[model samples]
Target: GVFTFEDEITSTVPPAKLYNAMKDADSITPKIIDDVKSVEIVEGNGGPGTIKKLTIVEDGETKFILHKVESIDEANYAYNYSVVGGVALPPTAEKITFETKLVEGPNGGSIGKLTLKYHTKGDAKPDEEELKKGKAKGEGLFRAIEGYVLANPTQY
Candidate 1:
């Protein structure tokens, strides 16, 4: 069975800018987001079916996770990916999936909608706090990218 969660965030940054930053995240993420140590493309050319390894540091301990790209619709500002394995993932979950979209909001701003799904082992559900942590992490990443784009106006 699968458990799902969703969240929305409003950003002053434009949709295109936010979308571009996420699309080219590998080049700028490590530099802008402190905890995200590195992003490496383990397979494919960053398109659908590509696999990426993300090295992260939390509480001075390093951890890594692998994400397999499912789809990226540039024109629609949508992205989908799944976590197949790694210590970063909770043991009760077989897979973690994410669906995200950046859409235009009033006055040149944007609204980010994020949906997360956990494919659990049997009928097991993750703890509430663990799910909250996952949402927090995603929110933190989005805010970090927004800060980077806002600080550097002329860049994506």
Candidate 2:
């Protein structure tokens, strides 16, 4: 079986703006969390196969390199990305992937939904502690993006 987690947030901003902010996750994440040291683009740009290195510090320090734009739909305002490699995980986990979707809401705002899917190598199933950690990380990322939009209202 596979392990998956999800988080969703709603904002008064339009879908187009929300989509743009998310596309530049590397630049926006640090603004929300001081612990996020930086986001360096290792290769590619804002398209498929684009790679981004995320450096974050909390209880400890870790770096993750994400690959492929995966999918970007401007009209629908949705983007998806996957983790190609990272140095923060335990030896048991082999792969992790994340997908985020932004949709227009009925009240002229937008809703963002994020999905995290991961796989463990061997019999190393992720315990509840791991799930909690993953949830916190996902929430932090989403909040950072939301904070960016809140601080820079005109950017979106």
Candidate 3:
């Protein structure tokens, strides 16, 4: 079985700007996400078929995770990726997925909707608290990116 975590955020930044900042991970990741040490494109181009490796602090040592982009749609401002390595991928999780969709908001900004869904190996279901922890992390990243775009709207 699988469980999903969903949340919606409204950003004053336009969808196009937010989408550009996200798609240009190589240039934007470090600048927007303060806690990220570095990002290396280990495989493929930085597009739909690429894998992005991130270095984050863990127990006073640098640890990492490799995430593969599964889908991207500029027309709709949607992105989908899966955790393919490191601590983020639990042994019991057969697959861990993250998806985001951005739409034009009623206030002439952007409505950011995110969904995180994962399937387990047999009966090993994911804990709700763990999912919420992941969700908070994702939201923090999004807000940081939004702040960047808002700060420099013309650049994005």
Query: Best TM-score goes to which candidate?
Result: 1
**TM-score for model 3?**
0.90
Best by lDDT: 1
Compose the digit string of candidate 2's lDDT tens values, residues 1-156. 468887887878777776788887867777667777787778886686677777777567565544546777777787777656665454566756667788887787878888877778866687787767666666666667777887897987
- Which window of 10 residues has the lowest lDDT sum in candidate 2? 61-70
Candidate order by TM-score, decreasing, is 1, 3, 2
Provide the lDDT at 35 for model 1. 81
In model 3, the runs with Cα more than 4 Å from the true position are: none
Expressed as tens digits, the lDDT of each residue in 1-156 for candidate 1 is: 999888987999998888888777787889987888899999899999999999988789998988889889999898788888776578888888877788899999998898888899988887897788777766776787788899987887
Error of 3 at 128 (Å): 2.0
The number of clashing residue pairs in each candidate reads 0, 0, 0
C-alpha lDDT of residue 36 in model 2:
74
Instruction: Tell me the lDDT of candidate 2.
Output: 0.72
What TM-score do all the candidates reach, one by one? 0.92, 0.80, 0.90
lDDT of 3 by residue, 1-156 (tens): 787878988988889889887777666777666557788988897778788888877666788988888899999998778777887777778767888899998777999898888778887778877786678767766777778787888988
lDDT: worst 10-residue window of model 3 = 26-35
